[PDB]
Amino acid sequence: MKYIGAHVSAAGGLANAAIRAAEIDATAFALFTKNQRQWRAAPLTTQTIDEFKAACEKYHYTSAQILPHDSYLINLGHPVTEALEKSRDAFIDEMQRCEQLGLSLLNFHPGSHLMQISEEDCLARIAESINIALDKTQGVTAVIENTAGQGSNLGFKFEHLAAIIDGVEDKSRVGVCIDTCHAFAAGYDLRTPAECEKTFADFARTVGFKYLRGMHLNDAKSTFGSRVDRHHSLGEGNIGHDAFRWIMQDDRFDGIPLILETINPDIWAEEIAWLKAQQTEKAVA
Ligand SMILES: [Zn+2]
Numbered sequence: 041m042k043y044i045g046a047h048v049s050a051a052g053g054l055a056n057a058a059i060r061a062a063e064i065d066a067t068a069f070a071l072f073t074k075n076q077r078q079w080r081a082a083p084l085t086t087q088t089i090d091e092f093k094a095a096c097e098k099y100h101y102t103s104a105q106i107l108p109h110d111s112y113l114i115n116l117g118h119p120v121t122e123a124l125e126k127s128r129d130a131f132i133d134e135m136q137r138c139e140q141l142g143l144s145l146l147n148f149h150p151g152s153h154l155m156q157i158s159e160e161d162c163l164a165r166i167a168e169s170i171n172i173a174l175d176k177t178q179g180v181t182a183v184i185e186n187t188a189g190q191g192s193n194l195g196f197k198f199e200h201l202a203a204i205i206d207g208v209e210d211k212s213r214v215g216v217c218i219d220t221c222h223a224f225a226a227g228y229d230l231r232t233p234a235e236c237e238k239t240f241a242d243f244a245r246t247v248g249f250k251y252l253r254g255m256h257l258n259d260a261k262s263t264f265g266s267r268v269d270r271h272h273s274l275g276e277g278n279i280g281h282d283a284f285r286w287i288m289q290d291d292r293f294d295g296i297p298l299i300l301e302t303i304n305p306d307i308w309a310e311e312i313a314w315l316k317a318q319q320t321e322k323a324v325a
């Protein structure tokens with residue numbers, strides 16, 4: 041079974057994310073559990089937690105179907121150790137919020153070296169950040185998202201993801217999420233079925249599908265290899281519709297949240313319905 045949805049708004053409270061997902065007939069969703077800017081969020085109340093859990097149960101969203109995203113301001117590889125510690129504090133807080141909400145996954149971009157430390161050293165700092173958070177929480181898997189590679193952001197090569205995982209002690213609570221826009225921007229082609237298979241065999245050799253815990257299904261406004269992160273609605277960007285048919289027809293993408301971060305929320309219900317239909321419509325190679 042595939043689980044298909046969108047990164048919906050949590051405006052008016054976390055439970056409204058589940059309600060919004062249900063209104064677009066999603067079978068998965070993503071959300072932020074707090075505003076991104078605030079270093080430290082007011083603690084979750086018992087009232088917020090119960091309303092969230094009640095809405096998830098009303099609309100049949102289990103923990104396996106929900107892929108929260110951390111704040112973009114967290115840098116788990118920060119070269120300034122005092123800033124690293126503040127990012128680690130925020131990440132532990134985000135992981136604790138997930139635990140309190142009954143969530144089992146947390147998706148995050150790995151980090152950035154700010155031209156002050158080597159790639160190797162930044163990746164090692166990120167693995168240690170994960171280890172710290174996993175020692176301070178229970179039941180939540182740290183899901184590393186690949187990136188477009190803008191600026192000094194790491195995670196644009198699959199080998200980066202594998203290097204982080206190698207440094208994680210409890211590998212049962214680490215995984216990865218592949219964002220199709222990010223992959224394409226980083227130079228992994230997706231424009232034909234053959235190219236999709238080439239990209240995912242590379243993923244299999246370097247990381248392995250045993251670590252795959254989510255996908256972000258985005259077309260790309262930016263161009264191939266541009267190392268620019270600009271999403272587009274399915275079919276409207278430079279990837280095109282065939283990659284998404286290919287993903288929907290491949291059983292390796294079952295059982296995990298498949299999340300739109302496409303740029304027109306008015307068509308999310310149509311994008312979700314189209315994705316569901318491609319599972320059984322005309323086969324691509
Ligand atoms: Zn992301």
Ligand SMILES: [Zn+2]
Nearest residue numbers: 185219256301
């Ligand atoms: Zn993404």
Ligand SMILES: [Zn+2]
Nearest residue numbers: 221269270271
């Ligand atoms: Zn992006």
